[PDB]
Every structure is written in C-alpha cells, then in structure tokens.
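Design review, sub-item: ligand-bound model
Attendees: FS, YL, KQ
YL presented the inputs for the chloride ion complex:
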Amino acid sequence: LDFHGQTVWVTGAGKGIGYATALAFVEAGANVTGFDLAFDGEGYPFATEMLDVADADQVRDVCARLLNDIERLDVLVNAAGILRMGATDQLSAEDWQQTFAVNVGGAFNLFQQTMAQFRRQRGGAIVTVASDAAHTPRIGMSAYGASKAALKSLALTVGLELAGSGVRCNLVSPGSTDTDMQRTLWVNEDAEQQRIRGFGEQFKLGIPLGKIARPQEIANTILFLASSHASHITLQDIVVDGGSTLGA
Ligand SMILES: [Cl-]
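KQ shared the predicted structure:
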C-alpha cells in the first residue's frame, strides 16, 4: 500500500491505535503529522503538533497555521478518544462531559477546520476510529459507546456532505486491542483470556478468532480504507474484532 508523497494527519497519534497508524503511514511513504494532547516520548518518526482536539479554538489555530503551507491534505485520520467507564447512573458529570467533548467534539472540530480544504482540493480520504461499542450495547460503557455512535453518525454525514467533492469517508471499529489503556484497565491478570472466552453473564460474546487485536491490525485496515485500493468505498464501517459482534 503506497502513500509516497501524500500529506496525512492523524489525531491521538501519541499512543496506541493512533500512534500505530501514524507509524504505518510513515512506513508506507507518507508525510505524516500526528496530533495529540501530549507527546511524552523522546522521539517520534513523524512530525508532531501538540493539540487538544476538544479545544475548538486551538483546533482552528493549528489547522489554519498548517493549512497555510500545505497544498493538499490527502488523508485525515480521526483516532483521538478517551474511555471513561461506569454504570450509567454512577458515571460522574465530568466523565460524561469529557467523553463527548473528546470522542465527538474532537472530530467535529477537525471537520469544521478541514472540510473547506477537502472541498477546495476536490478529493482525499477520511478515516475515523469508532469502536465495537458503537455496534452493540456494552455494560459499563454506555457513555463511551454512545459517544462513539455519535462519532460514527457524524462521520458518515460528513462523508455524504463531501462526496460531491470526491472525498471518501469511512470508519474502522476496533474490538479489544493490546494497548496500554487496555492492559492497565484489565488488572484481572488472565484478563486477556477471559475476554477471548467471553462473559455470558454480561451478554458479551467471546472472540471467535481466539485472540485480541494488535494495533498494527487496526492501522492496516485504516491504510486500506485511505488508499486507492478502496477507490469505490465510502460511508462504510469495518469492524476489526475477530468476529466478536458476529458481524453487527
Ligand atoms: Cl497555534
């Protein structure tokens, strides 16, 4: 999958899926810029822009600055996100509000500052990282799954709005993935095997392929959706979860 010479932006690029994705675009030849709240590593194989995707003004400022110097934004990847868990009636107000400002507002702000650019150049590709929790109700994640469902719907209507301009807009929806947020947030030790088996009691199915996702495996799916191999694919959402939702 060749991306040589293309300008690619990736949010949440500091860790996990976003970092894996930004790195994959570099390994595919692209000119990559990663955006995130912090970049605490000592080095990054892409250019990096500190940015709070929930701060609508900061997004306007950084995008205006970078759009001044780039002809063309070939690929935008929305991968920012935060996970706040709890039963619906126990979730704190802060957790509810920041879940939405990040998981939905983040993209919203990026769309508001980039959609003119996509209309100007008349093409390119967008991929947004939703979640399996947007395809199926998840105990403990009512708010998180709902933000990712709003994100998906936002991204699809944006896709319909730009299709006249020839912009393809798609989503990937990951299941359980080996990340630092997932590792720490497990704590049950053999938690990785308990996830693969499933939790019948909470109506959460196991994983038929018998393994959890690797971040590179999400990133590769994004690269396909961003590439010209997917030249007739728009408004689709690919679930990457070993089959755990049985295709839902
Ligand atoms: Cl700035």
